[PDB]
Design an enzyme around this catalytic site. Sequence first.
Site, PDB file in Angstrom:
ATOM      1  N   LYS A  54       0.794  -1.120  -0.046  1.00 48.97           N
ATOM      2  CA  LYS A  54      -0.103  -0.046  -0.034  1.00 48.97           C
ATOM      3  C   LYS A  54       0.750   1.273  -0.082  1.00 48.97           C
ATOM      4  CE  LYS A  54      -4.738  -1.357   1.075  1.00 48.97           C
ATOM      5  NZ  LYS A  54      -4.731  -2.759   1.105  1.00 48.97           N
ATOM      6  N   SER A 307       0.754  -9.925  -1.063  1.00 48.78           N
ATOM      7  CA  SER A 307       0.490  -8.481  -0.905  1.00 48.78           C
ATOM      8  C   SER A 307       0.692  -7.875   0.610  1.00 48.78           C
ATOM      9  CB  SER A 307      -1.260  -8.269  -1.252  1.00 48.78           C
ATOM     10  OG  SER A 307      -1.931  -9.132  -0.913  1.00 48.78           O
TER      11      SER A 307
END
Lengths: 321, 327
Positions: A54, A307
């Site tokens: 992110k 991720s």
Amino acid sequence: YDLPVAIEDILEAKKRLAGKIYKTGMPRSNYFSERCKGEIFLKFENMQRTGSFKIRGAFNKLSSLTEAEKRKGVVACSAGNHAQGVSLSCAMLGIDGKVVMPKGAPKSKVAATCDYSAEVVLHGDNFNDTIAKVSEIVETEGRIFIPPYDDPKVIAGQGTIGLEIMEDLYDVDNVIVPIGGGGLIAGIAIAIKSINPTIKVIGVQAENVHGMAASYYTGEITTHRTTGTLADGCDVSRPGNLTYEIVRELVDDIVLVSEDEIRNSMIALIQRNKVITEGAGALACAALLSGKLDSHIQNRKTVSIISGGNIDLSRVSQITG
Amino acid sequence: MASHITYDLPVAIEDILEAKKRLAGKIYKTGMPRSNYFSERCKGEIFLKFENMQRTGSFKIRGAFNKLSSLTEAEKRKGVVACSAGNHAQGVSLSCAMLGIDGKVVMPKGAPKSKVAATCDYSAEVVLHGDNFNDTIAKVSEIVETEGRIFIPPYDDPKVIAGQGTIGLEIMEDLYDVDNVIVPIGGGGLIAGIAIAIKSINPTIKVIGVQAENVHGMAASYYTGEITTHRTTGTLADGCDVSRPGNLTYEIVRELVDDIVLVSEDEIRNSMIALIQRNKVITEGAGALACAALLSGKLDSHIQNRKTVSIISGGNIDLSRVSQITG
Ligand code: NA
């Protein structure tokens, strides 16, 4: 024909990230390659700054703002990873950041974001309360809201992963990607499709909640959610506008994995590959072990995105116990 | 430096080349990414070589496989034997399964059940015997003399050293401009192999060893000029709990290893915590040793504005122990 993000946005992002955010490992996996009867590589975005990808999209947005925009301060809401991504970026760029959270978000996540420099505000006992407060803060304080996915620069930042993949392994056949609101796969797909469109880009979501998947099958934007999931980073009932536009055009397929399959994937990753993954970080690998990609993956080169790894070790032990 | 090693040391670049050929398409190159946390902390570029993600959970498969594969069929038909409480057992055991070789592994009556289970799962017969290494090593020679099995040393053997040295070749391939390689030392097989591979190719690269303050046989030997025993007590880096180094390894090390540094239990613990919490990788204590040396400040004059590879030698530790050692 016309999409809201192009390869140039990802090449611009690369340049803003140049010398600040760095490439993650992508090693061939012994266990998964034996299991899957093809070459499986694991992209370690869990080892990216803050513990998830992110930071990439958040850093691109925050630094592509003008000084006139940076002076305004910025604001977001999250109970985990997005909060951390903007915070590190806010420290790195020296932008004043505020972050709203619910009144029961993991204490490990609640301190990680303060340490990263941004001001935490605990408020409300649900997610929509969080958004209620953000709207009030933007209204009153005039701060720039930082979307977790539905933003061209956020998506561009995320896309830098796609470049990294083809840079390290450009006889890759398949890329398997987790979806929440849709920014990671959107970025990745633009990067991949613009340079080598014969590389298949495949999405993954939980059976329990899969807004983007439902939109992808439906042909317009729609909600889907029954209950939560181990892949909590991808607990997103409704997908983004910009992101769905890109996914419907570029994504070759989106598959759904069960909770047990997410768990099995977490177990294999920590146990057989020694990497700490959170549930959302194990979604892509879940799809490999499920058997739903066997015809794509067998005797081919497949990249699986990890991720994130922001999960307490006790929770890993609970799930992988 | 290539010819001097060939002519004067018991293992050479040629042995490493033979090993790369024997391992081809059987053992694969582990990842070697730049680390965010360690580069930030060290004010230089730190790369992590993930032998914790090698088959069996450690690098020991390389040496065991090279050794077992190098045997004639006549030798293979004699069967093999070894003793270990973990990583060597697993390496010998899988290698035996991959080669069709009859293996027997002696483990102390009290090894972590996970390691005993893993060694069994493969192929080898596990003989549980005695409460320590001296007990298990005693049982091995009986098997040798009774059954005529070929003993597979964990480090002091030119095929085993050569096997480990394939790691050195992978570092050069991925990162031709590496300046430093930091390597844990038990008996010295890993660092001996890497040192020969690295220095034969580009001898301007530093190869630096790391051991626990608690037990550092190789370090004591190095700094004494003579094979020497050292052990105060046990360590978190249990994989490198070796009180006396190998003969071949010491010879190679004292010529090719630039230095050996010692790290405390707190430093080992701090490094494990950093690797798992900040870098999301599972490492056992020995696999944390090189990273411990970097974080200790004891290599500060070598790594700032440089490219440095840290060997994560193993990841064979129960997740329960990782939890109690870490946060
Ligand atoms: Na020296």
